[PDB]
């Protein structure tokens, strides 16, 4: 299913993931096209943080769901 990943920069990308897709794998898919390291990838959905070991079924994520990607810059 096609979901929408929107960064804090407004940049929204389309991602193809299945309900059984793990969040950690989702991060990899994002880095695959964008390049943002998973360590700095903080996916927020409906106010809840997506745990790496969780899947899209856990948080009940449907198609076209817009996720908010917060970048964790580790350089301060």
């Amino acid at each position: 299913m096609q979901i929408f990943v929107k960064t804090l920069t407004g940049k929204t990308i389309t991602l193809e993931v299945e309900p059984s897709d793990t969040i950690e794998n989702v991060k990899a898919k994002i880095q695959d096209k964008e390049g943002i390291p998973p360590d700095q990838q903080r996916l927020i959905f409906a106010g809840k943080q997506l745990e790496d070991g969780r899947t899209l079924s856990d948080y009940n994520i449907q198609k076209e769901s817009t996720l908010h990607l917060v970048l964790r810059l580790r350089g301060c």
């Binding site: 960064t7 940049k11 810059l73 350089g75 301060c76």
Partner: protein
């Protein structure tokens, strides 16, 4: 603690770099430095940017937090005025390092943008696509929310 800060300031106030002017302590704080950064890179060379150096009470064991007082349209600076300098980060810091060295690193990063690890993916992408368009936006901003060139 503040003893070293006073020394560093006293030294820098005698032989200040060509890119650092109006360097003095805060009106009511010796642990706060006030200075105007003069970038040479275009179009930041049209104006100056004021920076505020905040020295921690655990100096020099704790790195001095430097932030921008003014607004600089740079892909390595945030909309508020925060920066990510590895030299004074919680991931890397040496008490033997003086503020003068940090100022140099800051100046280098302000002049030469880092498209590898930036603070603004939008500006970084733009810079690596159209330098002219980026220059236009940065220019108007510099001559809008920037301090006059000393």
């Amino acid at each position: 603690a503040s003893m070293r800060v006073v020394k560093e300031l006293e030294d820098l106030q005698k032989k200040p770099p060509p890119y650092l002017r109006n360097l003095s302590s805060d009106d009511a704080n010796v642990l706060v430095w006030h200075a105007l950064l003069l970038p040479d890179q275009p179009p930041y060379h049209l104006k100056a940017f004021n920076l505020r150096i905040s020295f921690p009470p655990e100096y020099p064991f704790k790195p001095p937090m430097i932030k921008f007082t003014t607004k600089i349209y740079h892909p390595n600076v945030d909309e508020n005025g925060q920066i990510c300098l590895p030299i004074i980060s919680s991931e890397n810091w040496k008490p033997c390092t003086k503020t003068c060295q940090v100022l140099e690193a800051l100046n280098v990063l302000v002049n030469r943008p880092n498209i590898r690890e930036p603070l603004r993916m939008d500006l970084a992408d733009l810079l690596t696509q159209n330098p002219e368009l980026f220059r236009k936006n940065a220019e108007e901003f510099t001559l809008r929310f920037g301090v006059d060139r000393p």
